[PDB]
Amino acid sequence: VDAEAVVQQKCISCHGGDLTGASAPAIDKAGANYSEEEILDIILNGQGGMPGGIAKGAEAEAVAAWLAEKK
């Protein structure tokens, strides 16, 4: 899975092109604040103002792993 391409397709409309926040909060350092599993749960299911379902399965897991290393 190309995790960065997925994030640019699916996440930047709310989180900003460089992930530093736009309508929604920054995620560029999400791994400093969340575990990989917490990030996966957010992607699959949403959280607070974020909807669920935006990515699934291996795509979601690859994005969670990529973000979890960003600190």
Ligand code: HEC
């Ligand atoms: C707007 C329709 C969104 C899209 C598209 C995505 N996210 Fe989001 N996200 C959004 C909001 C409004 C919030 C805040 C909810 C909260 O209280 O935390 C979030 C939050 C996150 C978080 C947790 C907080 C943080 O790190 O800032 C993460 C890790 C996150 N979002 C990731 C994420 C990814 C990877 C997305 C693309 C697959 C994605 N979000 C899309 C709104 C929206």
